[PDB]
Amino acid sequence: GLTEEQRMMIRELMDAQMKTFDTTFSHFKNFRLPGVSREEAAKWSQVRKDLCSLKVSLQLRGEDGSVWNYKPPADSGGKEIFSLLPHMADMSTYMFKGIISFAKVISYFRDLPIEDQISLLKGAAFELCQLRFNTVFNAETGTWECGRLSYCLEDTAGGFQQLLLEPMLKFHYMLKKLQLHEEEYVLMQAISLFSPDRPGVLQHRVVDQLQEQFAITLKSYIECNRPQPAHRFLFLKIMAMLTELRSINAQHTQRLLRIQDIHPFATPLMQELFGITGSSSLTERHKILHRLLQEGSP
């Protein structure tokens, strides 16, 4: 079995997940949709590469049974490559709010100093979003099922194997294949959130201790509820996936900064999370995050 401390830890994480993960996307409303001079050529050509890896069609199912399908344009060499950005910023911002709420209900996170709470969320927001998204990913259809909204991968000229080149996509297939429990996903979220080596973290030693205990709890969970030799290296596979997810986080941050630079699209919350200015302490540069963290949890 697990210790009482370990059981309590899992209960609190699952509680937090239950209160703050809108798994059917019922409250995601009022989002935007695609509508009805030399060294910049190098930036644009790089941003062209940064976007045309992640191409999705968008499906909107109506209450009444009707379906709207959006197929995105071919790259004719212009603004059209940006057409999904407002929508993606709205969806990202929505997911980030849920992750902030997640962190806030966890006792161990609230007890950290506010600047560390900010630093950890800046560090982990993308990672936790991707972990939540994996739970709605259908590997058979290549589709993220977000209630009435779905995002379907548009196949490129190589096929299924050529899409697996793109690290974010490979990650979602690999993680989905492990067939994790709800409890194992939420422990993954905790391990990522409580990363002691994120930029700006002051209480490194406390965060390290916390991370270690979440990891130990995951390892024990696996030993007790999948005790057969088949799952002997599952914990280590999960940790390797967290390491890969961290690499992907870094690449994605850089892409976002490049796109933002030539076509502004980040919402104010996204600007704070990713280090963009629109105008001295961590608290004054992150006023929205700070407000969201000090507000009481519904």
Side-chain angles (χ1 to χ4, degrees):
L2 301 155
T3 60
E4 189 71 51
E5 192 174 40
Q6 288 170 343
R7 279 199 289 283
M8 197 60 259
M9 193 175 283
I10 297 178
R11 280 181 219 120
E12 181 169 50
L13 295 178
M14 291 291 279
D15 186 56
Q17 188 84 314
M18 177 274 292
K19 293 169 173 159
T20 65
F21 191 0
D22 181 11
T23 61
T24 65
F25 295 74
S26 48
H27 304 108
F28 180 48
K29 299 184 154 95
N30 313 138
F31 48 83
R32 296 164 284 174
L33 283 169
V36 308
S37 198
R38 198 189 265 169
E39 286 81 33
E40 231 80 38
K43 276 175 174 188
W44 271 84
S45 177
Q46 179 56 233
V47 167
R48 220 159 285 154
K49 298 163 195 147
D50 296 323
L51 292 169
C52 94
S53 32
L54 296 179
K55 198 160 58 165
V56 294
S57 66
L58 178 159
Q59 189 177 95
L60 284 149
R61 274 172 310 290
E63 202 82 63
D64 59 343
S66 69
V67 194
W68 275 107
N69 199 96
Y70 178 74
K71 258 188 186 180
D75 190 347
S76 344
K79 300 297 174 102
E80 70 279 331
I81 47 147
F82 300 135
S83 76
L84 271 174
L85 289 173
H87 181 77
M88 294 301 191
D90 290 348
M91 163 64 86
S92 291
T93 296
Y94 185 75
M95 290 296 286
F96 291 146
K97 288 168 72 87
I99 279 143
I100 290 161
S101 297
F102 171 76
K104 283 171 69 174
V105 347
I106 304 169
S107 54
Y108 307 108
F109 186 90
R110 285 195 260 104
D111 295 345
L112 299 176
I114 197 66
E115 300 212 325
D116 278 5
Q117 293 181 38
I118 287 162
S119 297
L120 294 171
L121 279 166
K122 282 171 69 83
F126 174 84
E127 294 181 15
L128 274 55
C129 184
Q130 295 303 316
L131 290 173
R132 282 184 167 188
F133 273 127
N134 191 248
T135 68
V136 302
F137 182 60
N138 182 326
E140 334 310 290
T141 60
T143 301
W144 289 273
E145 290 176 359
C146 304
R148 282 150 75 170
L149 263 175
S150 70
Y151 305 91
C152 184
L153 293 161
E154 278 251 290
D155 61 341
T156 40
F160 169 64
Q161 299 294 172
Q162 199 247 249
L163 283 170
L164 292 190
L165 302 190
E166 168 49 56
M168 192 72 276
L169 248 166
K170 188 175 178 151
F171 167 86
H172 281 283
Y173 283 100
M174 283 189 51
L175 189 56
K176 196 75 185 191
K177 205 218 283 96
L178 299 181
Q179 298 199 85
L180 300 190
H181 298 168
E182 301 285 6
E183 289 83 359
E184 295 165 335
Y185 275 104
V186 83
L187 285 162
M188 284 185 79
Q189 290 172 205
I191 289 161
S192 167
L193 180 58
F194 289 97
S195 285
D197 55 337
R198 305 289 194 196
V201 172
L202 290 202
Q203 299 293 344
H204 140 95
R205 109 100 60 176
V206 169
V207 174
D208 186 32
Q209 285 177 154
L210 291 167
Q211 192 180 57
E212 175 188 357
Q213 298 310 314
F214 287 122
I216 290 167
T217 299
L218 177 55
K219 193 175 172 139
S220 313
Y221 180 90
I222 290 163
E223 283 161 29
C224 297
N225 310 276
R226 307 159 170 284
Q228 57 272 60
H231 308 279
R232 167 179 176 186
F233 295 133
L234 182 60
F235 168 75
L236 288 172
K237 289 170 178 161
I238 294 169
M239 298 310 283
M241 297 280 53
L242 291 174
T243 302
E244 177 62 20
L245 182 54
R246 186 149 180 166
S247 173
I248 291 165
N249 187 10
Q251 291 159 333
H252 276 254
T253 289
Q254 311 159 230
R255 288 182 189 163
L256 185 137
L257 298 179
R258 287 191 288 272
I259 295 157
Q260 180 69 22
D261 192 20
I262 57 156
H263 179 88
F265 78 100
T267 57
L269 178 59
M270 287 171 67
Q271 291 175 15
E272 288 192 4
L273 291 165
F274 288 103
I276 296 144
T277 324
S279 62
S280 180
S281 60
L282 252 8
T283 266
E284 299 165 72
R285 282 179 279 113
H286 304 93
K287 294 209 262 281
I288 302 159
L289 258 184
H290 187 220
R291 182 186 178 182
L292 294 174
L293 287 160
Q294 66 179 44
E295 287 176 345
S297 1

